[PDB]
Amino acid sequence: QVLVPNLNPTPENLEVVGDGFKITSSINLVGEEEADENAVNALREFLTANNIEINSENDPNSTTLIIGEVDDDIPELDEALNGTTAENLKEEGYALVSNDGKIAIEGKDGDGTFYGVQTFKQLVKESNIPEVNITDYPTVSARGIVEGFYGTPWTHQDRLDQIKFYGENKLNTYIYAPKDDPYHREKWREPYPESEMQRMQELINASAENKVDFVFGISPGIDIRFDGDAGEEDFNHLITKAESLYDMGVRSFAIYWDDIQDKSAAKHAQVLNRFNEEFVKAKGDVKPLITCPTEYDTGAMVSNGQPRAYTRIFAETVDPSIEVMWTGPGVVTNEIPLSDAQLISGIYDRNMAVWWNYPVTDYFKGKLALGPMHGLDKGLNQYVDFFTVNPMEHAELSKISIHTAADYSWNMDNYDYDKAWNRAIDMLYGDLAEDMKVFANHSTRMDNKTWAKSGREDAPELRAKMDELWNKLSSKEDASALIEELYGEFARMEEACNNLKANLPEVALEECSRQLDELITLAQGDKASLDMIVAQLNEDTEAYESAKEIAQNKLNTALSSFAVISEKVAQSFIQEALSFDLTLI
Amino acid sequence: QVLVPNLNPTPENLEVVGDGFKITSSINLVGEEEADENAVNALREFLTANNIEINSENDPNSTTLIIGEVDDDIPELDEALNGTTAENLKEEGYALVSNDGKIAIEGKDGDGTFYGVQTFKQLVKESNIPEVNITDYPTVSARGIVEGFYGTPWTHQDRLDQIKFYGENKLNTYIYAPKDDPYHREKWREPYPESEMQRMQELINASAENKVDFVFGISPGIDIRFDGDAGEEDFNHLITKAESLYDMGVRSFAIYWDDIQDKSAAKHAQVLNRFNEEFVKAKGDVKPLITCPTEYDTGAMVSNGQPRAYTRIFAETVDPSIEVMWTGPGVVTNEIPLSDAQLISGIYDRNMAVWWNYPVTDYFKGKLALGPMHGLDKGLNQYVDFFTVNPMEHAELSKISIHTAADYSWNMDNYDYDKAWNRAIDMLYGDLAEDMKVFANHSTRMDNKTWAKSGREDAPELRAKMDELWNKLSSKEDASALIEELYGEFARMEEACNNLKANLPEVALEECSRQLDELITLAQGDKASLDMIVAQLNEDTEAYESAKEIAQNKLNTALSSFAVISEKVAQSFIQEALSFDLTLI
Ligand SMILES: O=C(CCS)N[C@H]1c2nc(CCc3ccccc3)cn2[C@H](CO)[C@@H](O)[C@@H]1O
Ligand SMILES: O=C(CCS)N[C@H]1c2nc(CCc3ccccc3)cn2[C@H](CO)[C@@H](O)[C@@H]1O
């Protein structure tokens, strides 16, 4: 009475200074005319949605809401704040104060005020708001998503929903770069058909409405020509393509050189340099150029602590103001330790950009990647200024992990993966969060068994209970309490998935139904594996064989089926149980 | 210009002193009346079998062979030896010199002469013998096999052949202790039927002829009673059972306490101490008593560098004379480092006996264990004086592993596991050795997925090549030459197994035919995996789908089979290749 709701991202400084209060049926609004337009529209939108009416003329005992920027002439704003302010904060910073009848939102800039509104929306539950002092700002200057995967691109409606979602969670960057949009890569020289041009316009419009930088990516590297008139003809295709998007309102651009056979470092860098001179600077209001080199992970860039030839030449040729992305120690890796960022930053003598390949699943499509940002150093901001994730072709389920990315990039120093994971599912799933937690917990780790691995381990608590079972059984100690307990877990998995099948909204259900079925199967095979152990302990041959065929048939279903989940946990347990000989005397 | 053939075990000191010579069709035998009877019978058997006649009257043109102990009075021996003796060597040591038509075998004791004859037998190839100076003796004084596994016990013929094989490889210990002989454990109180006693007499006799200590094990722990009249009766049952075996010539005995629920250390030890006194000492010619405690691996014996309650009590109570067995840091474990032996040896303050659970496969019967002794500290002899291995229910194929155990325990310091394994297969398989190497190289590592793991990794060099293929393909580099090399390895795996199916003697083929077909299946799936990769590289979609279906069926077949082989190499490669998504374009 009254408690601070789940917030995402976690604000830098939040203090509870009171007991909280109810916001009236209709309110007074001060500052609308000079405040940021986007911020105001997000406020209006929320206020309409929560049945809250705006007064035509001040009343004295309605709740008052004041909104604006530090540069603005609003005396009531300086008053309602009472001490704390956004003057001392970096771009996108804001102060928010809630004190008996008065909510004050002040941004350092228009972005700031918009962000303050988002926090305000998350603060209000039931018309009740807690009494708080807040100053808030991002750790990392550029935070967001690169739609950069292989497979079916996000639908136009998907992206519009993603862009809204980025705004709500203070993500400011969306990179358009679908490997399978023909006009982005395969037919990069060719202009967009009129109908896609108009859909693009809506995206840029929606991006501006949400303080998101729409970055238009192009990948010419498969066949771009570099020398002579063909080099001239090709460079002019790049400029043409860029201009047609610039004319629609695009102010951020990327040229990418990943996943190509050509390794002409000097020529790649020189294309970038010419585009930087003839397009970026010449336009004057365009953000820094973004790129990634053909060598983009530490394994590929560095040999024996020294940069390899391509990287060396690229690093020394590419202009200082161009943003360079890299993926970490590997393309899909467990971790980015600080020493890796330090290494790559020093090779490039600039703050680096990260293209994090998680939750992307294009390389192992059967598994859903449903875990938090995991493995990333909490001091990465020392060498990184731009942090993006590559998501799954499954736009709705990608939100869980994107939600944690939003918390990690905004408030890096206090990021707790486990807490951000739980908060993400809570905020996204409502009355279904506990069940969605059970399911998603078994689907966080990605491993193609060769070059690609990343994510928190699947269901670690349950894994540790399984190990303890084998430990007890092999030590020939009583294990019946732990066995009773594992029945509980396997029955819980199955119930959770069934409830999820019955109650998930279609938008989520269409992306995960097969994996839900997989987990039910594995749970059933897990339970039967228990029956099988109990039978051996009881020396009941009949009951053993009968549980064994069930367990083996469940395992066979799970292995033959497209969906993949819980490989090292629920699936491995069946394998472990079938390989454990308790028939020894 | 000989050369020295393969020898097992590796002699302590061997030196080539010349070019070698051919032994004549007929020879002069000196010392046959005075030297060890068992050594002479072994010698006569070898001569008979290699068409070498013995002169009844001396002939200066014939090769001269001289045999005896240091304690024997023989002038020719001393003369033929010329500087080298067994005088200052330990028990079981011998000297051997072959030089200028002379071969001199001198043992330190009768056991060493026998082993001298054994080295002679390995030295002669087609009447040719290298000219050598040898002094030789074991690192460890008790070396052998404990038949102590669960499963079908070895047949009577099995055991007779093993005992001969132990003789030839200088193994001096055989512990009879099969878990599923009802009279060993299940009905340990009940006497052996007379026909089984006759079978025992032949075992005892064969052991004596081969300098092997036949050790009679009994395991009363499931239900022995300790207190009052009940315990007295059960103690006399142990005496009776041992007496009946002593009466046939058994002079070593073991009483085991493993794999039972009753953890009464003081009682177990009291039983042992009583048996040590009223039986072993009462008899004067019985070797030290052998046991294992209910806590017999370091995880079960120790907590924070200190003994657990059972172990502490057992160690304080059990007589210093008694040999105590332990299995290392776990029951089935990768290694015994020196620090483990030192720890256990300190607790019991005595040199320890080792029960090594490799090549035993009772806990994972589908896999054959065909690797060398691996993981055992080369300095173990400082705290261990007794080394035995627990073999597979498969007697014949156990020989590969046992062969390397003979070399490790006899010549510990110079033991090379790769060399010994290679030598074992060369010596045992003859013309089939190169093919058997290909197959057995895939079947060395034991792993039940949970508590039990031990042995050399399966096909290491092939594993590293597969690793390098994935490292090239995921870096989009040219991998043609390496692909080609892999096609060759896989074809070779198939060729070897097919040649083994057609030409292996039945006694070995009976034990591995399922594992032969399984490796052929995986080899074919491996090939198909390569096909699938090359199709993906060439964008040939239909050849890919065709290869995919084959790779997948071959894996499914192997996974379904009782037979297990090459989990982490040949089998894993298919899973790796199916998960490697190269259709992303
Ligand atoms: O990671 C990058 C650029 C990093 S700044 N590019 C893409 C990329 N390249 C790789 C490794 C090389 C490879 C590509 C396709 C098939 C096999 C290996 C992985 N990935 C990502 C995950 O599959 C894929 O989504 C990306 O589009
Ligand atoms: O190891 C010993 C005494 C070592 S001085 N005893 C035997 C033994 N006990 C265990 C662990 C307890 C266990 C037994 C059956 C099923 C599951 C666990 C393993 N093993 C060996 C490997 O299977 C088995 O061959 C042995 O007969």
Residue numbers in the entry:
A (entry chain A), B (entry chain B): 40 to 624
Quote what the paper states about this structure.
Posttranslational modification of metazoan nucleocytoplasmic proteins with N-acetylglucosamine (O-GlcNAc) is essential, dynamic, and inducible and can compete with protein phosphorylation in signal transduction. The O-GlcNAc modification is removed by a single enzyme termed O-GlcNAcase (OGA) (Gao et al., 2001). Inhibitors of O-GlcNAcase, the enzyme removing O-GlcNAc, are useful tools for studying the role of O-GlcNAc in a range of cellular processes. Previously reported compounds showed undesirable inhibition of the human lysosomal hexosaminidases, and there has been no direct evidence of the cell penetration of these compounds. This work reports derivatives of the GlcNAcstatin scaffold, showing potent inhibition of human O-GlcNAcase with up to 900,000-fold weaker inhibition of the lysosomal hexosaminidases.
The β-hexosaminidases have a narrower (difference of approximately 1.4 Å) and shallower (difference of approximately 5.0 Å) pocket than the OGA enzymes. Interestingly, a cysteine residue is located at the bottom of the hOGA active site (Cys215). In an attempt to generate a potent, selective hOGA “suicide” inhibitor, the N-acyl group of GlcNAcstatin D was extended and modified to contain thiol-reactive groups that could irreversibly react with the cysteine located in a pocket at the bottom of the active site. GlcNAcstatin F carries a 3-mercaptopropanamide side chain and GlcNAcstatin G a penta-2,4-dienamide derivative, both potentially able to react with the hOGA Cys215. The extension of the N-propionyl side chain of GlcNAcstatin D with an additional thiol group (GlcNAcstatin F) increases selectivity for hOGA to 1000-fold, showing that the elongated N-acyl substitution abolishes the binding of the compound to hHexA/B. The molecular basis of the increased selectivity of the new GlcNAcstatin derivatives was investigated by X-ray crystallography using the CpOGA V331C mutant that perfectly mimics the hOGA active site (Dorfmueller et al., 2009). The CpOGA-V331C GlcNAcstatin F complex (2.5 Å resolution) reveals that the inhibitor-binding mode is similar to the previously reported GlcNAcstatin C/D complexes (Dorfmueller et al., 2006, 2009). The 3-mercaptopropanamide moiety points straight into the pocket of the active site, whereas all hydrogen bonds seen in the GlcNAcstatin C/D complexes are conserved. Interestingly, the sulfhydryl group of GlcNAcstatin F approaches the active site cysteine (Cys215 in hOGA, equivalent to Cys331 in the V331C-CpOGA mutant) to within 3.5 Å, although the side chain thiol points away from the inhibitor, and no disulfide bond is formed, in agreement with the absence of time-dependent inhibition.
